[PDB]
């Protein structure tokens, strides 16, 4: 896919270096349009950074901090849309990219830690925010840059905070450069001006000729003067055309505005017009893919299986909110207070964060650590939207066995804009999530678990959706001792897929099941009870079916399907005792029914309307 989603962490430290690097690689491998932000921090020396060569547009902001690599290749980047800004003031931040200036005495011929020189030969557009560059003890040429060309005319916030201190005598701009404002020493690094050398009123142009004026809806530079020739569409890119709005998906007559479907209708995703919304987003009637349905609109399962927001006539159902969704918005975790709202919550909206305080208490709030026998709230849960944070579990529980019916987790809300799961600070040994069969979006982290196996065996690929998803191993209990001790699946578990020890958890198994365990075989003729097979399930025969091995005892659930009743026949049913018959529909038992010689639960020939005390030897009420 050419569209990815960027992280959201600002200045927070990495969870792990050897995990952070792979996270960056998986998020930006082949991506061309970066929805969300773009963050590069604490990059070690000799960083690859090759995956960044093909990024062309950033929809959030660009952040670079605390780096020791001497060059970050971002040539093909063209436009930064500044939807959400860093510190609400900046869209391109580059700071602290050098040595801490403490000791770190370089050896002879050693390049000091710090970005040597910015190299961005195509970045010629910023639609909002400013520039923040400071504390770079090895940066060169940052001052000889005409930043008002890069900024957009609508971007009145042309505020730049630029620093010039350096510890190295920078080489002068090469003579081939014009205006002496060069990104670097090489001849091709001279800045290209597209806003100070254009015609009268031309926002962008190819060069200093009045016929070089761009179309009114391009972004930065143009190959031609037609809206299909923009280097980047300013507002919307419909099928290789730069337009102001995606075409409407409903046609209205000018007299009644009655809705008629329009085949050329397009939904809006970012700055693009898509015929059908992506997998995880929700299509609303107003024509935009989103994540949370508007008010009085509820998720409905579609015929083609998709999910879409539909209007409620009656009040919409009592959706059981989680955390951070509607009114438990800033609530961090689940105490013993909010947990009571989670009774009978088959579907939950929003996250479920679990800080250690939940199982370590808070004296100020008078909240004890939540009981390991307080988790019965989460038993009938079947769907969660958003992430599921975990940083505390009871020792009495050897795993996360609580969620036995959670089927779907969708990454509509990711922890840092990247993570849909997390398993850090835990002491658990496995998961036991036997029903989780879909993981909508976002990387799943399982971090700092010293007692945890069953991460090299879980079926990953069958849960993910996009190629951008990945799972990251860090500080996990070693797989070598996991295998040596034997914390893997068992034979019935198909393809070696499982979640924890014991034959209970298998995503699939060859043979049948009796409710929660993959079985070796059903019990049709041989077995303590008698079971018939149905969808590879061993449903137990009715008790009244006389167990007759060598013959099919029962042909289904009800009593009628017994081969031959053990005790008596009340046709068409098998009974242990031929029950006393009844005259009316409204309950009344005059007996009036006795078993026959072969068990045919015959009615009593005698009739006693007065309820004769005398009783026949067969049990019938004998007439007085």
């Amino acid at each position, epitope marked *: 896919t050419q569209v990815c989603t960027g992280t959201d962490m600002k200045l927070r430290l990495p969870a792990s270096p050897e995990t952070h690097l792979d996270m960056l690689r998986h998020l930006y491998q082949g991506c061309q349009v970066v929805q969300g932000n773009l963050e590069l921090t604490y990059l070690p020396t000799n960083a690859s950074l090759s995956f960044l060569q093909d990024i062309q547009e950033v929809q959030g902001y660009v952040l670079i901090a605390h780096n020791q690599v001497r060059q970050v290749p971002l040539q093909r980047l063209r436009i930064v849309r500044g939807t959400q800004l860093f510190e609400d003031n900046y869209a391109l931040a580059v700071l602290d990219n050098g040595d801490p200036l403490n000791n770190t005495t370089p050896v002879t011929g050693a390049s000091p830690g710090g970005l040597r020189e910015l190299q961005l030969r195509s970045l010629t557009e910023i*639609l909002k925010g400013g520039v923040l560059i400071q504390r770079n003890p090895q940066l060169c040429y940052q001052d000889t840059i005409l930043w008002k060309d890069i900024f957009h005319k*609508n971007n009145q916030l042309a505020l730049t905070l630029i620093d010039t201190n350096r510890s190295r005598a920078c080489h002068p701009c090469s003579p081939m450069c014009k205006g002496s404002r060069c990104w670097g020493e090489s001849s091709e690094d001279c800045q290209s001006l597209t806003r100070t050398v254009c015609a009268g009123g031309c926002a962008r142009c190819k060069g200093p000729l009045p016929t070089d004026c761009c179309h009114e809806q391009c972004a930065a530079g143009c190959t031609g003067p037609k809206h299909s020739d923009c280097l980047a569409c300013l507002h919307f890119n419909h099928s290789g055309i730069c337009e*102001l*709005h*995606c*075409p*409407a*998906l409903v046609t*209205y007559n*000018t007299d*009644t*505005f009655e809705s008629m479907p329009n085949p050329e209708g397009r*939904y*809006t995703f970012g700055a693009s017009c898509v015929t059908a919304c992506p997998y995880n987003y929700l299509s*609303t*009637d*107003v*024509g*935009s893919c*989103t994540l*949370v349905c*508007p*008010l*009085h*609109n509820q998720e409905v399962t579609a015929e083609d299986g998709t999910q879409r927001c539909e*209007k*409620c*006539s*009656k*009040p919409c159902a009592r959706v059981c909110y989680g955390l951070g969704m509607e009114h438990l918005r800033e609530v961090r975790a689940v105490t013993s207070a909010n947990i009571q709202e989670f009774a009978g919550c088959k579907k939950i909206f929003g996250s479920l964060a679990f800080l250690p305080e939940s199982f370590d208490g808070d004296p100020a709030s008078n909240t004890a650590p939540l009981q390991p026998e307080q988790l019965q709230v989460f038993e009938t849960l079947e769907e969660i939207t958003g992430y599921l944070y975990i940083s505390a579990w009871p020792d009495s529980l050897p795993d996360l066995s609580v969620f036995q019916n959670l089927q779907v987790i969708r990454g509509r809300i990711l922890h840092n804009g990247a993570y849909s799961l997390t398993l850090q600070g835990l002491g658990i040994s496995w998961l036991g999530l036997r029903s989780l069969r879909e993981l909508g979006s976002g990387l799943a982290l399982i971090h700092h678990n010293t007692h945890l196996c069953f991460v090299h065996t879980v079926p990953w690929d069958q849960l993910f959706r996009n190629p951008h998803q990945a799972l990251l191993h860090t500080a996990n209990r070693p797989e070598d001792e996991c295998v040596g001790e034997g914390l893997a699946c068992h034979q019935l578990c198909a393809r070696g897929h499982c979640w924890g020890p014991g034959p209970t958890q298998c995503v699939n198994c060859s043979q049948f099941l009796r409710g929660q365990e993959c079985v070796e075989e059903c019990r049709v003729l041989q077995g303590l009870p008698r079971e018939y097979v149905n969808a590879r399930h061993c449903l137990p025969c009715h008790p009244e079916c006389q167990p007759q091995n060598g013959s099919v005892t029962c042909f289904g659930p009800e009593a009628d399907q017994c081969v031959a009743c053990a005790h008596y026949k009340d046709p068409p049913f098998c009974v242990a005792r031929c029950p006393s018959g009844v005259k009316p529909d409204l309950s009344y038992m005059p007996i009036w029914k006795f078993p026959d010689e072969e068990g045919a639960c015959q009615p009593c020939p005698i009739n006693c309307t007065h309820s004769c005390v005398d009783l026949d030897d067969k049990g019938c009420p004998a007439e007085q």
Partner: antibody
Amino acid sequence: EVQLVESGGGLVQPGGSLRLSCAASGFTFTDYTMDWVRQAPGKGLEWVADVNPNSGGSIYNQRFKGRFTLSVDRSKNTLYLQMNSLRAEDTAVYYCARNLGPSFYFDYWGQGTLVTVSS
Amino acid sequence: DIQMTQSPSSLSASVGDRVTITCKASQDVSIGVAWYQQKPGKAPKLLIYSASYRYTGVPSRFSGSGSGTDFTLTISSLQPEDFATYYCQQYYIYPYTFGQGTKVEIKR
């Protein structure tokens, strides 16, 4: 907290022109078609128009079909009611409202801007 | 052009009693009523939608009812905070018109 700050309301001559701006804040802008509803001095409510941000389409009462325009600047979360071809019976408070479902009952309203038309 | 009418024009009543406001539509609408409460000088607040179900957060002191071509708002325990104008709106057909108004004032 949902809030729709209306602005641009001021004196304008009969048959004039004005550009009301309803700066929305506190909700995802491109998920709710917005409405313009005018309450005249000492009168019941009317219904001028509604606009859907993604398409840019507009649906209005017939009486204003050839005189009012709706524009969306989704970059600034604004919403411009281009009022044109004015008349004496235009003085009103223009409540900028939000459709709950796209079914024409509103819940969140602005404070309004007393657009006054007179020479 | 569904001329959605209401009655009575004025409804003067003290605190803690029962009063009724009748909204009758020009044509037949299955359930298309939205009852609004407006204070004298501030933005209207939605009260009722679908003619029976109260809007979120609205006090349960009263709740409308009806359908078709007859709807009603019935106050159970009037309070000083509920002396304001009211309207009904039919959101069913073109062009989604409102009511006309019915005030509530304290008798003395």
